[PDB]
Enzyme design. Structure first.
Site, PDB file in Angstrom:
ATOM      1  N   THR B   1      26.194  20.772  21.806  1.00  0.00           N
ATOM      2  CA  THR B   1      27.425  20.373  21.130  1.00  0.00           C
ATOM      3  C   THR B   1      28.187  21.603  20.660  1.00  0.00           C
ATOM      4  O   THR B   1      27.599  22.653  20.413  1.00  0.00           O
ATOM      5  CB  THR B   1      27.113  19.489  19.902  1.00  0.00           C
ATOM      6  OG1 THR B   1      26.380  18.337  20.328  1.00  0.00           O
ATOM      7  CG2 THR B   1      28.398  19.039  19.211  1.00  0.00           C
ATOM      8  N   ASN B  21      25.413  16.762  24.818  1.00  0.00           N
ATOM      9  CA  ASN B  21      24.291  16.377  23.951  1.00  0.00           C
ATOM     10  C   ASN B  21      23.397  17.610  23.831  1.00  0.00           C
ATOM     11  O   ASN B  21      23.761  18.547  23.127  1.00  0.00           O
ATOM     12  CB  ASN B  21      23.484  15.173  24.451  1.00  0.00           C
ATOM     13  CG  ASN B  21      22.428  14.737  23.436  1.00  0.00           C
ATOM     14  OD1 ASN B  21      22.502  15.104  22.262  1.00  0.00           O
ATOM     15  ND2 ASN B  21      21.450  13.955  23.880  1.00  0.00           N
ATOM     16  N   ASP B  43      21.141   9.209  22.621  1.00  0.00           N
ATOM     17  CA  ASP B  43      21.684   8.944  21.292  1.00  0.00           C
ATOM     18  C   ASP B  43      21.576   7.466  20.932  1.00  0.00           C
ATOM     19  O   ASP B  43      21.797   7.086  19.787  1.00  0.00           O
ATOM     20  CB  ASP B  43      23.132   9.435  21.175  1.00  0.00           C
ATOM     21  CG  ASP B  43      23.217  10.926  20.886  1.00  0.00           C
ATOM     22  OD1 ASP B  43      22.180  11.535  20.543  1.00  0.00           O
ATOM     23  OD2 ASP B  43      24.324  11.495  20.992  1.00  0.00           O
ATOM     24  N   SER B  72      27.030   8.410  17.520  1.00  0.00           N
ATOM     25  CA  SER B  72      27.086   9.864  17.403  1.00  0.00           C
ATOM     26  C   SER B  72      27.048  10.265  15.932  1.00  0.00           C
ATOM     27  O   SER B  72      27.183   9.421  15.047  1.00  0.00           O
ATOM     28  CB  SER B  72      28.390  10.380  18.037  1.00  0.00           C
ATOM     29  OG  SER B  72      28.535  11.786  17.893  1.00  0.00           O
ATOM     30  N   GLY B  93      24.911  20.058  15.936  1.00  0.00           N
ATOM     31  CA  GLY B  93      23.692  19.911  15.159  1.00  0.00           C
ATOM     32  C   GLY B  93      23.009  18.559  15.193  1.00  0.00           C
ATOM     33  O   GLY B  93      22.086  18.322  14.410  1.00  0.00           O
ATOM     34  N   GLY B  94      23.439  17.680  16.094  1.00  0.00           N
ATOM     35  CA  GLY B  94      22.835  16.362  16.171  1.00  0.00           C
ATOM     36  C   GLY B  94      22.844  15.696  14.809  1.00  0.00           C
ATOM     37  O   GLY B  94      23.885  15.594  14.166  1.00  0.00           O
TER      38      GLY B  94
END
Ligand SMILES: N[C@@H](CCC(=O)O)C(=O)O
Ligand SMILES: [Ca+2]
Lengths: 351, 190
Positions: B1, B21, B43, B72, B93-94
């Site tokens: 990302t 991702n 996700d 997300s 950073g998820g």
């Protein structure tokens, strides 16, 4: 003088990105007369070339736009699961999730939305034609650029786990049996062709043209699900931003399909009940309060968040200040509450 | 990302966070297109109560479904002060995107840190499950000791995020900052 860290300063326009080349592309677009959206799209296309790690044409994302007149909007260009996707598609024969299937197989891909998102934004809020904002990226792909420390490092670390396992990927990012090294030149001829056709034919090139065909074939030959119908049916969606008020400041971020806006506003609502300024940065009290507040938000995230076009998200309740207060009152600044004692909140009294 | 921010001479602002991702996504290029394919499907919640690569969990709401957009955590964000765009930020950073951006906001409003100060400050994060207060290097041993005494399970881990932000001054001047966590990035203007 009392500052240890100093921000970069400019009087007219500014661009901040993970890549020097992409940032300069954006700044040049601004200097050329393009607005923020024009530059943002140019940067997005440039990163799809110079930052293959995350910049992309084969992924998706979100854009927050706020005009000088205050109009704030959100562009959702998040990938859509293929029409053939199913609830248990990532479970092995025993019913347990297989991370390989959702991370490294062709089944791990959603229908890309980046190109659709950038064109939706460019067409409605930009001023320059697509070919002009794609040009910088096209040149970088065609003529190549020097591999820096960031890219060399990522290719060696993360890239080594997947890139060399696919013929077409290896042909582009690998050289002499090793990931491209710092100082090497990375030329992406095929990507340049893709960019050139998008510039000349518009976004339809990606969703209905040669690129769409290439994606569909890649999938069909390897057990993937993305089809031409999926690509032709993809649509970026403009949505209302999720926002809140924190001590008189208004905060705007992404609404579902993202959980970002809702939980940032929710947590801020919780924190508003505490004198954060008094505690100060890096204090055990400030961190304690924030860590606790975050727990409740993530618990709620696991139950209430999803694609709004398929499930009703109780965003009003989740961003309700009275609900936040009910959470704030549960926080003990001297004792953390184990996650085992925290469940999604009861939103009934707030909706 | 990856996240990037833009503010033009007229005061228009744009914040974009987009991704494949994981790094390089699936690492699969789509035929002869030269385009890397995302692995965004992770996700979705693959099975109720089972964590994904970021330790995130779900159930019905975020279950996989045809034509559905996976949930997300991406948070391109803008903070308004006195009716005007004031802070434009965001980060990769998820699961950590939410807390990284949150800290940028708190650092700016509550602690009054300039955009560079807010960016270079250390970050911490708790996502309920796993039950751990994740921290970056940079917090006082005295402070971490107090947190442990409060019952927090402190876990020192890798640096989190890559904020690329812009703050707009009262007179319209621009201030920006790239993250020390990411090399070869840049914030520039004219
Ligand atoms: N796929 C994650 C972001 C991943 C990243 O930070 O690499 C999401 O959309 O929340
Ligand atoms: Ca940096």
């Amino acid at each position: 003088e009392e500052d240890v860290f100093h921000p970069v300063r400019a009087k007219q326009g500014m661009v901040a990105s993970v890549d020097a080349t992409a940032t300069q592309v954006g700044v040049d677009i601004l200097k050329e007369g393009g607005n923020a959206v024009d530059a943002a799209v140019a940067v997005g296309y440039a990163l799809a070339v110079t930052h293959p790690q995350a910049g992309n044409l084969g992924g998706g994302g979100f854009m927050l736009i706020r005009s000088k007149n205050g109009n704030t909007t959100a562009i959702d260009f998040r990938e859509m699961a293929p029409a053939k996707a199913t609830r248990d598609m990532f479970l092995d024969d025993q019913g347990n999730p297989d991370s390989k299937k959702s991370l490294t197989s062709h089944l791990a891909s959603g229908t890309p939305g980046t190109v659709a998102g950038f064109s939706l934004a460019l067409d409605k809020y930009g001023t320059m034609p697509l070919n002009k904002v794609v040009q910088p990226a096209f040149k970088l792909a065609r003529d190549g650029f020097i591999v820096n420390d960031a890219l060399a490092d990522d290719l060696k670390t993360y890239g080594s786990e997947v890139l060399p396992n696919h013929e077409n990927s290896k042909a582009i990012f690998w050289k002499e049996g090793e990931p491209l090294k710092k100082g090497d030149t990375l030329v992406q001829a095929n990507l340049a062709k893709s960019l050139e056709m998008i510039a000349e034919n518009g976004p339809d090139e990606f969703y209905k043209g040669t690129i769409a065909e290439q994606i569909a074939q890649e999938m069909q030959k390897n057990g993937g699900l993305i089809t031409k119908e999926d690509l032709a049916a993809y649509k970026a969606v403009e949505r209302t931003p999720i926002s809140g008020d924190y001590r008189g400041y208004q905060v705007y971020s992404m609404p579902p399909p993202s959980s970002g806006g809702i939980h940032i506003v929710q947590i801020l609502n919780i924190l508003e009940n505490f004198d954060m300024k008094k505690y100060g940065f890096g204090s055990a009290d400030a961190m304690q309060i924030m860590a606790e507040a975050e727990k409740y938000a993530y618990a709620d995230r696991s139950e209430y968040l999803g694609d709004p076009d398929f499930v009703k998200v109780p965003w009003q309740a989740l961003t309700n200040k009275a609900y936040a207060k009910s959470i704030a009152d549960q926080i003990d600044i001297n004792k953390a509450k184990p996650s085992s004692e925290i469940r999604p909140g009861k939103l009934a009294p707030y909706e | 990302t990856t996240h990037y921010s833009v503010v033009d001479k007229d005061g228009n602002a744009v914040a974009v966070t987009y991704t494949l991702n994981t790094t390089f996504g699936t690492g699969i290029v789509a035929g002869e297109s030269g385009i890397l394919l995302n692995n965004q499907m992770d996700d979705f919640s693959a099975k109720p109560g089972v964590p994904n690569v970021y330790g995130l969990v779900g159930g019905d709401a975020n279950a996989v479904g045809p034509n559905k957009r996976p949930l997300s955590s991406m948070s391109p964000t803008i903070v308004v002060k006195d009716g005007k765009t004031w802070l434009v930020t965001g980060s990769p950073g998820g699961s950590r995107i939410i807390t990284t951006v949150l800290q940028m906001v708190v650092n700016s409003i509550d602690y009054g840190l300039n955009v560079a100060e807010a960016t270079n400050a250390p970050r911490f994060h708790h996502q309920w499950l796993p039950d751990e207060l994740r921290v970056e290097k940079g917090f006082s041993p005295d402070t971490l000791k107090l947190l442990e005494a409060k019952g927090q399970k402190v876990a020192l881990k890798e640096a989190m995020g890559s904020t690329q932000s812009i703050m707009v001054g009262p007179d319209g001047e621009l201030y920006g900052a790239s993250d020390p966590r990411s090399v070869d990035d840049l914030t520039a203007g004219y």
